[PDB]
């Protein structure tokens, strides 16, 4: 077997263990916030938002889109883990703006021999509108209560800035 970047991460983790020492924080996030954002490698959510360890739940998927898994995860965050505020954070230069479902599902048929023509990969073109659509999906879900403040924002991957949309 050939080593990969996982082995690099295991080695690098030793330094973090030495800094972290032995210290327990509560399962319930201190700020009562859950953030929904993209997986993008150029977004490190804690320094961008000023999070201390234990401050907020961080949910991440392709595009920061609201899905059944995001709602599942938020109902656990809120009803089991005490959170009561949501931030939907999309970002500039997102991979979701680089394909359409039709073009991507043709590519998958060619490359993987799978027909995913009926599956929605959740692309978008207008970042602000994508944030407003995902906030509406949360507000229309009966699993997300009404006394939950939901904010929308955009992270600029070139500058580090977070700016409100919703």
Distances (CA, A) of 95 to 4, 39, 101, 121, 156: 24, 10, 13, 11, 14
Instruction: Please check if 118 is assigned to a binding site.
Output: no
| Closest distance to Mg ion from the beta carbon of 119 (Å) | 25
Place of tokens 């983790």: 13
In this structure, what token pair is assigned to residue 129? 């509108």
By CB under 5 A, the count of residues binding Mg ion is 3
Instruction: Please check if 90 is assigned to a binding site.
Output: no
Applying CB under 5 A, the span of 8-16, 42-50, 104-112, 144-152 interacting with Mg ion comes to 42-50
Q: In sequence order, which residues have a C-beta less than 8 Å from that of residue 127 and are 6 or more positions away?
A: 90, 91, 92, 94, 97, 154, 165
Instruction: Please check if 91 is assigned to a binding site.
Output: yes
Site string for its own copies, 1-30 (x = CB under 8 A): --xxxx-xxxxxx-xxx-xxxxxxx-x-xx
Is 77 a binding residue for its own copies by CB under 8 A? The answer is: yes
Residue ranges of the binding site for Mg(2+): 126
């Amino acid at each position: 077997m050939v080593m990969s970047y996982f082995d690099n991460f295991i080695k690098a983790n030793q330094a973090y263990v030495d800094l972290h020492g032995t210290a327990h924080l509560p399962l319930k996030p201190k700020t009562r916030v859950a953030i929904v954002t993209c997986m993008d490698s150029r977004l490190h959510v804690a320094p961008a938002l000023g999070l201390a360890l234990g401050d907020a739940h961080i949910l991440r998927n392709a595009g920061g889109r609201v899905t059944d898994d995001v709602i599942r995860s938020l109902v656990i965050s809120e009803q089991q883990l005490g959170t009561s505020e949501i931030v939907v954070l999309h970002h500039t230069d997102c991979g979701a703006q680089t394909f359409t479902n039709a073009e991507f599902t043709e590519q998958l048929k060619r490359d993987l021999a799978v027909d995913a023509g009926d599956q929605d990969f959740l692309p978008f073109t207008d970042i602000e509108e994508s944030v407003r659509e995902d906030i509406a999906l949360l507000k229309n879900s009966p699993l997300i209560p009404e006394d939950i403040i939901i904010s929308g924002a955009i992270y600029d991957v070139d500058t580090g800035r977070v700016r409100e949309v919703n």
